[PDB]
């Protein structure tokens, strides 16, 4: 999540991020319910207050909310104990925010995002861009190994495909932000823009990337002014699932058919319907490719035709159950590397070694009756050294 991302940042970058007022408002908005009040309280105050007082302002009931919000803001480093005054920059910058100091767009965003997904799968008709190709490949969801040949999709790439467009886009931006620092792009500049969007050379490159994903659109030959799309700030289903492992996809887009074809066999193609059968051969292939069963049920669940919505569960339980069993069937044998110790002549010392292995956290399985245990090879030397020491 967005708040998750801010927490995983250094104090130096955070204070830099708390620049123009719009950022402080953006970070303020995500304060869950309580801390928003606390921010307003100690906003006009220039003198730190005791930590005990904050604790006693929340009734015993719903006390857990008092601590969790406090921990969240401590992570955000909004205030400091100073022994709980807010950051002088945040207080000042926030005070600036607090009285101080269309239909075409959505279609464009949906289409431009789709072509990226088209490229993700082996779709010959997809947008081609060297920067985009290396972006996805370096994003951890694609791999080429040969610049001349088009890249394939990694194990995580297939899972990314099934995720809903909101989470599908957000995960991509989250990966984009992390790699921005590695490639030499300042994280604060891009991160600050995203917040300001919700309402320089680095931005110009960043804006071009955002234009490529379809989140932003200048419409005026790349003018200074841009018009963000709906997805930039941050739909009815079409699949009918039958009890006999049949999917009737009411799809006109080639991408959705490509998605459904990942984990099912396509039988017939009609302009507003495609007949797909969820055969165990396909699903096992989909699971082998990297997909997780929960995603398949979720992917079919979210794109559920309205007719199935009235039924509960919308997906017939046997289909959902059967898909899971197909997943669990593959992993019947849980392979786990380890080192086995037998011929435990020292029965008394076997327990001592057992206790030592447990303390180190290396032991995986043990059998007291047979006086044997298995330890991962990583810790094999440690136990081997312990045995040699005697």
């Amino acid at each position: 999540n967005l708040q998750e991302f801010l927490g995983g940042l250094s104090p130096g970058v955070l204070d830099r991020l708390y620049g123009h007022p719009a950022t402080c408002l953006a970070v303020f908005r995500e304060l869950p319910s309580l801390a928003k009040n606390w921010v307003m309280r100690m906003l006009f105050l220039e003198q730190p207050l005791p930590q005990a007082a904050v604790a006693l302002w929340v009734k015993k009931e719903f006390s857990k909310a008092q601590e969790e919000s406090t921990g969240l803001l401590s992570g955000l480093r909004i205030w400091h104990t100073q022994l709980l005054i807010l950051n002088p920059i945040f207080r000042q910058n926030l005070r600036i925010a607090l009285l101080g100091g269309v239909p075409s767009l959505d279609k464009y965003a949906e289409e431009r995002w789709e072509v990226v997904l088209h490229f993700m799968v082996g779709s010959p008709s997809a947008a081609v861009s060297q920067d985009l190709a290396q972006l996805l490949s370096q994003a951890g969801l694609m791999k080429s190994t040969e610049p001349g040949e088009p890249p394939c999709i990694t194990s995580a790439g297939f899972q990314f495909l099934l995720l809903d467009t909101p989470a599908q886009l957000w995960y991509f931006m989250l990966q984009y932000l992390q790699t921005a620092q590695s490639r030499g792009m300042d994280l604060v500049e891009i991160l600050s823009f995203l917040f300001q969007l919700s309402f320089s050379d680095s931005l110009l490159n960043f804006l071009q990337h955002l234009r490529e994903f379809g989140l932003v659109f200048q419409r005026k030959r790349k003018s200074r002014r841009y018009y963000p799309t709906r997805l930039a700030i941050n739909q009815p289903g079409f699949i009918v699932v039958e009890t006999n492992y049949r999917l009737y996809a009411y799809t006109e887009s080639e991408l959705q058919i490509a998605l459904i074809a990942l984990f099912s066999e396509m039988l017939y193609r009609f302009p507003n319907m495609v007949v797909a059968q969820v055969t165990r051969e396909s699903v096992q292939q989909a699971i082998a490719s990297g997909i997780t069963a929960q995603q398949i049920i979720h992917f079919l669940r979210t794109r559920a035709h309205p007719v199935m919505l009235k039924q509960t569960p919308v997906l017939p339980p046997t289909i959902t159950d059967q898909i899971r069993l197909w997943e669990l069937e593959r992993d019947r044998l849980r392979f786990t590397e380890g080192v086995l110790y037998n011929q435990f002549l020292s029965q008394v010392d076997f327990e001592l070694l057992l206790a030592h292995a447990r303390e180190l956290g290396v032991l995986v399985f043990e059998n007291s009756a047979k006086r044997l245990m298995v330890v991962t090879p990583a810790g094999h030397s440690d136990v081997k050294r312990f045995w040699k020491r005697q």
């Binding site: 069963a293 929960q294 339980p317 959902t320 159950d321 899971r324 069993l325 997943e327 669990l328």
Partner: peptide, 15 residues
């Protein structure tokens, strides 16, 4: 009033 058994009523799959 003679409700269905647990196994038939709700899924028994671990997942």
């Amino acid at each position: 009033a003679k409700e269905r058994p647990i196994w038939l009523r709700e899924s028994t799959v671990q997942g």
